[PDB]
């Protein structure tokens, strides 16, 4: 604290050499300082996460020059994607500028901290809660992307099978029973559980899940086969 007192002090003095109002300059310098510190915190959270859990499934990049962090989740491509942390200037509202006057001044250079998760061929700006654990954020995004891919397979399903998207997952209906498809945030892998008997999933679900994980062919093709199999065996019994 005393350190920044002196350094800051030097800074405002030179500003006086050139006579540019202080209250802005100190606001700018010091807010951006806090943003950078939070970003640092997040980075150490993610690297800690890359060691503690997530080990096989998190890769972390901190960058100097304009210090920025990007996190690589689900390093395994799916039959690409990362999330970018970023400091950038929010332009002043034309209406904010008109309102601003004297003590309330828009003339201060001001900016926010924000994130945009990269997706194969797209970019989306994600609101950032001021109280957001880095783990919590990683979860949030992974679930979004989740829902997206799992709805994509649902569409690639067979047309006659009644499927339902809800509960963060997919429900494939088989004779008033359900197969439930989700994705684990960390692994980013497909998880097939059974409606009846949620604690022990039948052998053919387990074997399906293993085959999806092999990434040899689209999930939908497998799940289609598993639907027809599941039908047949239940009747045959």
């Amino acid at each position: 604290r005393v350190f920044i007192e002196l350094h800051l002090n030097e800074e405002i003095a030179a500003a006086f050499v050139l006579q540019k109002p202080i209250l802005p300059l100190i606001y700018n310098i010091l807010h951006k300082f806090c943003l950078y510190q939070r970003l640092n915190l997040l980075s150490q959270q993610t690297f800690q996460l890359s060691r503690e859990s997530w080990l096989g499934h998190l890769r972390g990049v901190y960058d100097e020059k304009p210090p920025r962090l990007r996190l690589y989740y689900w390093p395994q491509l799916n039959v690409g994607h990362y999330i970018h942390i970023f400091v950038n200037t929010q332009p002043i509202s034309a209406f904010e500028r008109t309102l601003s006057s004297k003590r309330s001044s828009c003339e201060y250079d001001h900016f926010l901290l924000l994130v945009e998760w990269h997706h194969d061929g797209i970019v989306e700006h994600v609101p950032l809660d001021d109280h957001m654990d880095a783990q919590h954020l990683l979860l949030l995004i992974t679930q979004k992307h989740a829902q997206l891919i799992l709805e994509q397979i649902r569409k690639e399903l067979h047309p006659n099978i009644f499927s339902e998207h809800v509960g963060g997952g997919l429900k494939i209906h088989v004779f008033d029973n359900e197969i439930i498809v989700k994705v684990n945030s960390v692994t980013g892998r497909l998880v097939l559980s059974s409606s009846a008997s949620p604690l022990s999933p039948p052998r053919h679900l387990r074997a399906a899940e293993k085959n999806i994980a092999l990434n040899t062919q689209p999930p939908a093709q497998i799940l289609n086969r598993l639907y027809f199999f599941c039908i047949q065996t239940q009747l045959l019994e």
């Binding site: 350190f3 300059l25 300082f33 950078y36 510190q37 640092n40 100097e64």
Partner: peptide
């Protein structure tokens, strides 16, 4: 210690930003 070092990095980067401006 290196966390505090990172606090400094945050400051010096803030400063470089304000200087460029």
């Amino acid at each position: 210690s290196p966390e505090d070092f990172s606090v400094v990095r945050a400051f010096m980067q803030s400063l470089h930003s304000s200087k460029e401006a």
